[PDB]
Amino acid sequence: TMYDFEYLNGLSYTELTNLIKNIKWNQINGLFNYSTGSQKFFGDKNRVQAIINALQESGRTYTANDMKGIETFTEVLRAGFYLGYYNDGLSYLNDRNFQDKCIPAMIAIQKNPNFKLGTAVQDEVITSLGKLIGNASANAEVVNNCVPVLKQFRENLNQYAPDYVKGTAVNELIKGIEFDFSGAAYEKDVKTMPWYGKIDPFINELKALGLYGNITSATEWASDVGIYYLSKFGLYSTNRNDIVQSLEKAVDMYKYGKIAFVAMERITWDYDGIGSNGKKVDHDKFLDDAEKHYLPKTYTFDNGTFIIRAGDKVSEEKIKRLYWASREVKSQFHRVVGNDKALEVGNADDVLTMKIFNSPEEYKFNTNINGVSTDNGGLYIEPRGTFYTYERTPQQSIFSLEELFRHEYTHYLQARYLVDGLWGQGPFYEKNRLTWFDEGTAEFFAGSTRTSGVLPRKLILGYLAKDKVDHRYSLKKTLNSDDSDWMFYNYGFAVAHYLYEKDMPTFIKMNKAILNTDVKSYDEIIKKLSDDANKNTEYQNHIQELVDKYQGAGIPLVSDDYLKDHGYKKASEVYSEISKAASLTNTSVTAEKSQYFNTFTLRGTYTGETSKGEFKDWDEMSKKLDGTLESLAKNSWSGYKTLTAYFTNYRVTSDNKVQYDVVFHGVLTDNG
Ligand SMILES: [Zn+2]
Numbered sequence: 114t115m116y117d118f119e120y121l122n123g124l125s126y127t128e129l130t131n132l133i134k135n136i137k138w139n140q141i142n143g144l145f146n147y148s149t150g151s152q153k154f155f156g157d158k159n160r161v162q163a164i165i166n167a168l169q170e171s172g173r174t175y176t177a178n179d180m181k182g183i184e185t186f187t188e189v190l191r192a193g194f195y196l197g198y199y200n201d202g203l204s205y206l207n208d209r210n211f212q213d214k215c216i217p218a219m220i221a222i223q224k225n226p227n228f229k230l231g232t233a234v235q236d237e238v239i240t241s242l243g244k245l246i247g248n249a250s251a252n253a254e255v256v257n258n259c260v261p262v263l264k265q266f267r268e269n270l271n272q273y274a275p276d277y278v279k280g281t282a283v284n285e286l287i288k289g290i291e292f293d294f295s296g297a298a299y300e301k302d303v304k305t306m307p308w309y310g311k312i313d314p315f316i317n318e319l320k321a322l323g324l325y326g327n328i329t330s331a332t333e334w335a336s337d338v339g340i341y342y343l344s345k346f347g348l349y350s351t352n353r354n355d356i357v358q359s360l361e362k363a364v365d366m367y368k369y370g371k372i373a374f375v376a377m378e379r380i381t382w383d384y385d386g387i388g389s390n391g392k393k394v395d396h397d398k399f400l401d402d403a404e405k406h407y408l409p410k411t412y413t414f415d416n417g418t419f420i421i422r423a424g425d426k427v428s429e430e431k432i433k434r435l436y437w438a439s440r441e442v443k444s445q446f447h448r449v450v451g452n453d454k455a456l457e458v459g460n461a462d463d464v465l466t467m468k469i470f471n472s473p474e475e476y477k478f479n480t481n482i483n484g485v486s487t488d489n490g491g492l493y494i495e496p497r498g499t500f501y502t503y504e505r506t507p508q509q510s511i512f513s514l515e516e517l518f519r520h521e522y523t524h525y526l527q528a529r530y531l532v533d534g535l536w537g538q539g540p541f542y543e544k545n546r547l548t549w550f551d552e553g554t555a556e557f558f559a560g561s562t563r564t565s566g567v568l569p570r571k572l573i574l575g576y577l578a579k580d581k582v583d584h585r586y587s588l589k590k591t592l593n594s595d596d597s598d599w600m601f602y603n604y605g606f607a608v609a610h611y612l613y614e615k616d617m618p619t620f621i622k623m624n625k626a627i628l629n630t631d632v633k634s635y636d637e638i639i640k641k642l643s644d645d646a647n648k649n650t651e652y653q654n655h656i657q658e659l660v661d662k663y664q665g666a667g668i669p670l671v672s673d674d675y676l677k678d679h680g681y682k683k684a685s686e687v688y689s690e691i692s693k694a695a696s697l698t699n700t701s702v703t704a705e706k707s708q709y710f711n712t713f714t715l716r717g718t719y720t721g722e723t724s725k726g727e728f729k730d731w732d733e734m735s736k737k738l739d740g741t742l743e744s745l746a747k748n749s750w751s752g753y754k755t756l757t758a759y760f761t762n763y764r765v766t767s768d769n770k771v772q773y774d775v776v777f778h779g780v781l782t783d784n785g
Pocket residue numbers: 520521524551552555556
């Protein structure tokens with residue numbers, strides 16, 4: 114039941130056409146393939162004509178039960194024109210004049226009483242017709258005959274548009290006609306087409322579909338097709354402004370929904386961005402208004418250097434937590450990195466803007482508004498200082514808003530304080546180096562806590578619960594990556610945590626390398642780690658130790674204690690009490706105004722005893738400082754529970770005394 118061209122070419126036309134009528138197109142071997150047999154088959158102007166005629170007779174007789182092989186009769190012809198496009202010698206099939214020979218057959222299908230939606234056959238006939246037009250020709254007479262089908266589809270819009278078959282049929286029918294028409298007037302004058310100004314009944318049928326109004330989630334696409342192709346076919350309308358008016362009506366009708374954005378795109382691209390009144394439509398303003406609709410609320414923190422623009426449905430509690438969460442990750446990150454001063458002067462990240470949508474659905478419009486992928490839980494655009502996300506439920510996503518935010522916040526920090534230059538575009542990216550690092554350390558810093566350094570996050574330990582066999586990445590494999598499975602980031606984290614807990618010296622040396630822009634240093638470290646097999650066993654067991662921690666693991670989240678009304682504490686007191694408790698010298702402070710509270714940032718020097726070595730110093734400094742935060746929180750002022758602290762710029766005095774710049778940040782309830 115599988116046929117070759119070298120068999121079909123020997124058959125009579127009468128025999129051939131009859132055969133095609135009762136076989137499927139895929140039964141022909143190499144139909145769309147260019148062969149010596151294919152060239153010979155379609156090279157016969159009479160044979161193709163016989164096929165065209167056989168189609169015409171099939172279209173004149175077909176019923177609801179039998180298709181009379183119209184699908185097969187259309188695909189062979191499609192193969193003909195397709196091969197006539199890409200190969201010389203069949204270039205007569207490329208000429209539209211010959212393609213017009215299909216129109217008499219097309220008309221026959223349309224004049225059949227069975228030319229409507231109904232049974233699977235009837236639907237596939239419209240589909241097959243539509244696909245043919247795209248490769249062949251349409252004139253205007255055939256276009257206008259599609260009206261009763263569009264009317265039929267439109268009249269039962271709420272029943273047919275959710276189905277794939279009928280829906281696909283109408284879409285293919287329109288899409289195909291548009292394809293033929295545009296390609297015909299590619300650079301030619303539009304005013305000189307055989308159909309120009311004659312397809313008004315068809316155009317009007319698209320207005321009706323496009324401007325349907327009463328749409329659901331199931332039928333939105335249908336009116337979308339209506340509007341999109343109202344614009345496209347409207348180019349062949351004797352009235353420009355009439356169409357534009359309908360497109361303007363589409364905007365007003367479905368305001369700040371998919372079809373609004375489509376209609377506005379249609380005005381700017383198809384109609385020079387000129388209104389029906391004849392004045393330039395301000396597309397920017399539309400997007401500006403659309404964003405204000407979805408992000409109506411603003412919350413300003415840190416003297417305006419931390420702005421959350423958010424949907425009307427996102428809780429004010431979350432807004433506050435997200436501020437406080439930023440402050441934890443910040444502190445932990447700064448401890449490990451040892452720099453809090455920004456690398457570049459006058460950047461975007463001087464203001465961190467976060468745009469949070471009400472939900473994933475509403476989130477999608479961001480890509481219309483700000484032109485950034487929205488196929489994600491959230492995204493940090495560095496050149497903009499901007500983090501786009503949406504509030505989510507526990508069902509919509511397994512990460513929550515804060516869990517996600519803590520993760521992405523780290524990317525802002527990495528770009529601002531760690532990687533000199535444009536993030537992803539420096540010497541460190543000339544080769545694949547930081548793939549595990551950037552994504553890995555961020556999964557990791559998301560685990561930040563107020564008084565307990567950085568902890569692992571349950572859910573991630575949850576992933577590592579899988580097959581120990583192979584699968585579990587080696588230290589060599591993790592550091593060096595084009596393709597790698599989703600688990601790559603989970604083992605990337607396993608490294609960052611391994612280094613943190615089991616080997617700080619390395620982890621610190623690594624960050625200093627990035628910080629100082631020393632690729633040579635960084636590579637030497639990655640080489641040492643990958644070449645040493647003992648460091649892999651250290652790592653392999655640590656992954657097991659993380660898998661061991663999962664059962665009783667938590668998710669680091671900002672505490673309810675942050676949101677409490679702490680009450681007035683005098684400013685001068687807080688500073689003194691902190692300065693003494695942390696043995697700080699030469700202190701200065703800045704107060705910053707926020708939306709719901711004020712905050713202070715205390716900057717001091719701490720000089721300790723004699724040095725125990727950089728990395729032992731860091732460990733002790735951490736323990737001493739986390740100790741100072743916990744002791745201050747034993748005080749009666751609830752405010753000390755909002756405190757976060759870090760230390761940077763490690764050095765040693767002429768007399769070998771430990772030295773750090775130390776920073777405290779917390780709530781300020783004193784106004785004066
Ligand atoms: Zn990330």
